[PDB]
Amino acid sequence: KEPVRFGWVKGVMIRCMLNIWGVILYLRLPWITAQAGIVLTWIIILLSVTVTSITGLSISAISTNGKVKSGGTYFLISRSLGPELGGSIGLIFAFANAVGVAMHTVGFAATVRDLLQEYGAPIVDPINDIRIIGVVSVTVLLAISLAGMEWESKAQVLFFLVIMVSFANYLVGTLIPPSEDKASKGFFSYRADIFVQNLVPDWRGPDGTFFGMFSIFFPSATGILAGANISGDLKDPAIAIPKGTLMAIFWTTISYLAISATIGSCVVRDASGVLNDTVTPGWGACEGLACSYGWNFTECTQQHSCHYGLINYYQTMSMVSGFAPLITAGIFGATLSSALACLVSAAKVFQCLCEDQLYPLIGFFGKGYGKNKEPVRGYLLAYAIAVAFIIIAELNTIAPIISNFFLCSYALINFSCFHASITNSPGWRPSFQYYNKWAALFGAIISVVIMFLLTWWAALIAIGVVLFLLLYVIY
Amino acid sequence: KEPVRFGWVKGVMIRCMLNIWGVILYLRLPWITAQAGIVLTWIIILLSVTVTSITGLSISAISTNGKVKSGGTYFLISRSLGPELGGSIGLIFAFANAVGVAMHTVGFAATVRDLLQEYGAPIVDPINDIRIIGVVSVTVLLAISLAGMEWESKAQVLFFLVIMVSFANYLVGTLIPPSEDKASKGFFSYRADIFVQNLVPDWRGPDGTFFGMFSIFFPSATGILAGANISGDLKDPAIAIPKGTLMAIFWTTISYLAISATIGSCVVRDASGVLNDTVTPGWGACEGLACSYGWNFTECTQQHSCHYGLINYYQTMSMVSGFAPLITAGIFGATLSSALACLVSAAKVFQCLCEDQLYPLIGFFGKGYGKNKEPVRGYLLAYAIAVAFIIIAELNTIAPIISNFFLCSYALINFSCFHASITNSPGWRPSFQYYNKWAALFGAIISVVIMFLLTWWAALIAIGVVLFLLLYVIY
Ligand SMILES: CN1[C@@H](CSCC(F)(F)F)Nc2cc(Cl)c(S(N)(=O)=O)cc2S1(=O)=O
Ligand SMILES: CN1[C@@H](CSCC(F)(F)F)Nc2cc(Cl)c(S(N)(=O)=O)cc2S1(=O)=O
Ligand code: NA
Ligand code: NA
């Protein structure tokens, strides 16, 4: 019985798009489109995908240099800068993936808890819901992923169709002439007067700054290494990984642009929500854009004390849509898919690190064979860390450190491509057309600049952990 | 004719105390003693001298390992971590010393300009005074230092006696019962009631924070490598450098403690300066500590709008003193001595780098022999940079970068001592008693933590310059 291999659509493209897409697409992008306007949000998106396209070109070059087993993303780091950084960056990549599993399972459990709190009775605790649901969900994900990889691929296809159904739902919803309940909350159909007004920024609050929007959005656009972490499970990686990875980046970027430019042309930033703010003939005069449509939000705007509209309501995308439960289904398929992708990625990197003769730090973890063609000893190690960080359940002070563990890998991958190309390393002959050393160097510099520019003490902790591991291995 | 050698008093101790002592001793320490109180200022001082004592122990260990020529402070960095960091850290040490020459000559020229603006007519420009005076002063310093090193040593002894005379002046001044002019500005003799009141903090203003006081004070306590940069000009460095360096640190620390604890027991933080704030019998009641001595500063304290007292007047030390011109003489001897020490240090490191066969980057600078036993080609290179940065004359936005160039050297010296001691390097047998690897490691970590904690973008620029030099040498 031969093992199973995947094509470039179900092996690289679907996985990369599903790992890129998260809950920012549903819960924060329409709000970023309000704080910053349409054109400046487009600039945010295009500045964020510039780093990931350069990293994608370095990854595509690495893939056209030979055959690499699954989880060997750090082999060029260890081959170009020594096996003590390579193993340490591999061990920190695999740990960040396992903590990302917990950060996505917590996000799924929060949605389920909010869903339960509205329909019926919860359990006695408000925050132990997030713990029980998180543990049961990660155990179900572990079961499906440990039952083979065809089942994991079928689950990923299910999540992809759920997300496409949510997109079609929202797009049909924006085309229906408004009802009273929608129009009172700020939704008007595609209008020429709302497109123009929403093009320019309107900053409000403590985080209402261009750098704050960049900080919220940038970490969500990463996730382009999901198809390259299973390179040994593909029919032919040297054609699959470049094409799939770059098509995934292109199409997620187009979806991000279309959603912002269409939400910004339908919903005004301020609305009351109550049904008796229609025009009263002879009410002197009213101020606001919606007056010409028949609504009066003057009291809100003057007092700044109502909770609807594009800039006040985080759930505006769910109400523009034709049927609201399908957006919740999309959120489920967007968080579970990323948790599953991160779990598979962490398991395979851990399994590659446990069988590394040049990095013998953690090779002692295996006692039972677990020879069922699956990384059982990398699955249990990822599951243990994921459950431990789910029990904590408060992960918003740990997210910067985990997100800098991912930019250290980006910096070292790009610099290893540059260092191997300028030194004429003996055995580095990439055949990808659109690769160039100076682009890789720029990516390596920008990754570290962004690392320190997001939060400097988290960057210090990340580099300190890398250094402690590297020096403990040497001594 | 043999060359001249110096003992441990005139070669290490005087030079180190004169480079440590600057203008913070005269113009900012009495104000730090007001913002933070006596005990918390003592904590500031003892936390700052903890880093420099550990670095002094590493330097003393380096000095008891053989004979090193003058300027070879980076030889252990290059011997323990490769000749591409050693030369780069040497080249950045020598450049920071030459910029420090300009930062001290500008401080001398500012004092002379203020002195001239009060007595007579200046030249037509207010800021070109600082340029003409700076250039002429650095040329005179270059002349005396290029005329041999006995003359430089005699100038240093002159500066030391001037500083001691200023200290005796101030200490006699604090013991004289107050006059009307002094008592009106806030000076009362040693009182028990003012010691107690001044022990606890009183924060005011934007920089009135413990971290702000630390930021102002810490960079001034460094300067402990002035006696180790001329190690090849001493009778026997292996006994001279440890004893002199540690005695210098000890005595400058004791002077810093005594000045703060005696200025804090004499001057109240708020005073008016005008002579008719004495007690009027029957003026209801007055609020403040000085009332029991016969003065009334209620209007000031309520309105926060007068310019005398320990926390408002930067020149309080000059008015407590018996004769005021001697404090200005002390300021002259405190800035010129540091400029001369930095110029000699930069010249000798540049001359050691120009004769290095393992770091051939700048060995091309020498055409004329200049064989008069003096680093002529390291003197002219230091003089050119000093004059170029004096012409700019605005150096308070460059000081953080230059001050991080000095903490990078501290971090790499300490880490090179640790790395050589744990690896059992072949030829590293220090015979200093009070050396220990873990103290050196702690010093190396604390230096980088402080580097990033003072100002993170300046630390990024410093590490980026080091990295650019290191990588340009490798490729
Ligand atoms: C959305 N993710 C962000 C981190 S944001 C949440 C945080 F972890 F920061 F808390 N970065 C990456 C990067 C990669 Cl490369 C991969 S992956 N599976 O391709 O290797 C996965 C992720 S992610 O899914 O965790
Ligand atoms: C008072 N100085 C501070 C820097 S504060 C002013 C700034 F430069 F930051 F702008 N640090 C050092 C360190 C050393 Cl080691 C030496 S020296 N001659 O021993 O090598 C001299 C100096 S300093 O005199 O420049
Ligand atoms: Na997803
Ligand atoms: Na001095």
Short mmCIF file of N, CA, C and O in Angstrom, two decimals, chain A residues 197-238:
data_model
loop_
_atom_site.label_atom_id
_atom_site.label_comp_id
_atom_site.label_asym_id
_atom_site.label_seq_id
_atom_site.Cartn_x
_atom_site.Cartn_y
_atom_site.Cartn_z
N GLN A 197 -17.78 59.63 0.90
CA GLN A 197 -17.60 60.08 2.27
C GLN A 197 -16.67 59.17 3.05
O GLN A 197 -15.97 59.63 3.96
N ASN A 198 -16.62 57.89 2.71
CA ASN A 198 -15.88 56.89 3.46
C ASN A 198 -14.46 56.69 2.95
O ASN A 198 -13.76 55.81 3.46
N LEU A 199 -14.02 57.46 1.96
CA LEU A 199 -12.68 57.29 1.41
C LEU A 199 -11.58 57.82 2.32
O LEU A 199 -10.43 57.39 2.19
N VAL A 200 -11.90 58.73 3.23
CA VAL A 200 -10.90 59.46 4.00
C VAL A 200 -10.95 59.01 5.46
O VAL A 200 -12.01 58.56 5.92
N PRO A 201 -9.86 59.11 6.20
CA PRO A 201 -9.85 58.59 7.57
C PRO A 201 -10.83 59.30 8.49
O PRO A 201 -11.34 60.38 8.19
N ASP A 202 -11.13 58.64 9.60
CA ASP A 202 -11.87 59.23 10.71
C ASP A 202 -11.41 58.51 11.98
O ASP A 202 -12.00 57.51 12.37
N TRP A 203 -10.39 59.05 12.63
CA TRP A 203 -9.78 58.35 13.75
C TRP A 203 -10.51 58.64 15.05
O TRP A 203 -10.86 59.79 15.33
N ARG A 204 -10.75 57.60 15.83
CA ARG A 204 -11.46 57.71 17.10
C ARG A 204 -10.89 56.70 18.08
O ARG A 204 -10.69 55.53 17.74
N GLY A 205 -10.66 57.14 19.31
CA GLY A 205 -10.25 56.25 20.37
C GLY A 205 -8.75 56.14 20.55
O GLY A 205 -7.97 56.80 19.86
N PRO A 206 -8.32 55.31 21.50
CA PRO A 206 -6.88 55.18 21.78
C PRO A 206 -6.13 54.43 20.69
O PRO A 206 -4.99 54.78 20.37
N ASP A 207 -6.74 53.40 20.12
CA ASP A 207 -6.13 52.62 19.06
C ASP A 207 -6.44 53.16 17.67
O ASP A 207 -6.04 52.55 16.68
N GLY A 208 -7.14 54.28 17.58
CA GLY A 208 -7.50 54.84 16.30
C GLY A 208 -6.35 55.53 15.61
O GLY A 208 -6.43 56.72 15.30
N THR A 209 -5.27 54.80 15.35
CA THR A 209 -4.11 55.33 14.66
C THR A 209 -3.70 54.36 13.57
O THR A 209 -3.99 53.17 13.63
N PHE A 210 -3.03 54.89 12.54
CA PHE A 210 -2.59 54.06 11.42
C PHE A 210 -1.71 52.91 11.89
O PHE A 210 -1.85 51.77 11.42
N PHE A 211 -0.82 53.17 12.84
CA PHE A 211 -0.01 52.10 13.39
C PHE A 211 -0.84 51.10 14.17
O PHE A 211 -0.52 49.91 14.17
N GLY A 212 -1.91 51.54 14.83
CA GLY A 212 -2.78 50.60 15.53
C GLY A 212 -3.53 49.68 14.59
O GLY A 212 -3.67 48.49 14.85
N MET A 213 -4.03 50.23 13.48
CA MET A 213 -4.65 49.40 12.46
C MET A 213 -3.66 48.41 11.87
O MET A 213 -3.99 47.24 11.65
N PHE A 214 -2.43 48.86 11.60
CA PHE A 214 -1.41 47.95 11.10
C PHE A 214 -1.11 46.85 12.10
O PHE A 214 -0.94 45.69 11.72
N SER A 215 -1.03 47.19 13.38
CA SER A 215 -0.77 46.19 14.41
C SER A 215 -1.88 45.16 14.48
O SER A 215 -1.62 43.98 14.71
N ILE A 216 -3.13 45.59 14.33
CA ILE A 216 -4.24 44.64 14.37
C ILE A 216 -4.25 43.75 13.13
O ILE A 216 -4.50 42.54 13.23
N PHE A 217 -3.96 44.31 11.96
CA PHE A 217 -4.15 43.54 10.73
C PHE A 217 -2.95 42.66 10.38
O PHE A 217 -3.14 41.53 9.92
N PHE A 218 -1.72 43.15 10.54
CA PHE A 218 -0.58 42.45 9.97
C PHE A 218 -0.44 41.00 10.42
O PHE A 218 -0.25 40.13 9.56
N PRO A 219 -0.51 40.67 11.72
CA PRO A 219 -0.30 39.27 12.12
C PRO A 219 -1.31 38.30 11.54
O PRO A 219 -1.06 37.09 11.56
N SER A 220 -2.44 38.77 11.04
CA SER A 220 -3.45 37.88 10.48
C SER A 220 -3.16 37.46 9.05
O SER A 220 -3.63 36.41 8.62
N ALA A 221 -2.40 38.26 8.30
CA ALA A 221 -2.10 37.96 6.91
C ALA A 221 -0.98 36.94 6.74
O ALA A 221 -0.73 36.50 5.62
N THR A 222 -0.31 36.57 7.82
CA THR A 222 0.71 35.53 7.79
C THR A 222 0.05 34.16 7.92
O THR A 222 -1.10 34.04 8.36
N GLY A 223 0.78 33.12 7.56
CA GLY A 223 0.19 31.81 7.50
C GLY A 223 0.38 31.17 6.15
O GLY A 223 -0.38 30.30 5.74
N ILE A 224 1.43 31.61 5.44
CA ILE A 224 1.68 31.18 4.07
C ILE A 224 2.50 29.91 3.99
O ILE A 224 2.78 29.43 2.89
N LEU A 225 2.92 29.35 5.13
CA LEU A 225 3.76 28.17 5.14
C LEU A 225 2.99 26.89 5.42
O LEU A 225 3.60 25.89 5.80
N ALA A 226 1.67 26.90 5.27
CA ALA A 226 0.89 25.70 5.54
C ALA A 226 1.04 24.65 4.45
O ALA A 226 0.97 23.46 4.75
N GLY A 227 1.24 25.06 3.20
CA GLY A 227 1.41 24.11 2.13
C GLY A 227 2.83 23.63 1.97
O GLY A 227 3.07 22.58 1.37
N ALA A 228 3.79 24.39 2.50
CA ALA A 228 5.19 24.01 2.47
C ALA A 228 5.61 23.12 3.63
O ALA A 228 6.70 22.56 3.59
N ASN A 229 4.78 23.00 4.66
CA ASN A 229 5.09 22.14 5.79
C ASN A 229 4.75 20.68 5.54
O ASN A 229 5.16 19.83 6.32
N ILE A 230 4.02 20.38 4.47
CA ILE A 230 3.70 19.00 4.13
C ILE A 230 4.29 18.69 2.76
O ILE A 230 3.73 17.89 2.01
N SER A 231 5.42 19.30 2.44
CA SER A 231 6.00 19.16 1.11
C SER A 231 6.28 17.72 0.73
O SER A 231 6.29 17.39 -0.46
N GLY A 232 6.50 16.84 1.70
CA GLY A 232 6.74 15.45 1.42
C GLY A 232 5.49 14.62 1.22
O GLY A 232 5.58 13.40 1.08
N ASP A 233 4.32 15.25 1.21
CA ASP A 233 3.05 14.57 1.01
C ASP A 233 2.41 14.97 -0.31
O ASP A 233 1.23 14.69 -0.54
N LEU A 234 3.16 15.64 -1.19
CA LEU A 234 2.64 16.17 -2.43
C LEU A 234 3.16 15.36 -3.61
O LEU A 234 4.20 14.71 -3.51
N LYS A 235 2.43 15.40 -4.72
CA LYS A 235 2.86 14.66 -5.90
C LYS A 235 4.18 15.17 -6.45
O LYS A 235 5.07 14.36 -6.76
N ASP A 236 4.34 16.48 -6.57
CA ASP A 236 5.61 17.06 -7.00
C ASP A 236 5.78 18.49 -6.48
O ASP A 236 5.27 19.45 -7.06
N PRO A 237 6.50 18.65 -5.37
CA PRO A 237 6.53 19.96 -4.69
C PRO A 237 7.10 21.10 -5.52
O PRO A 237 6.69 22.24 -5.31
N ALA A 238 8.01 20.83 -6.45
CA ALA A 238 8.71 21.89 -7.17
C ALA A 238 7.83 22.69 -8.11
O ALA A 238 8.25 23.74 -8.57
#
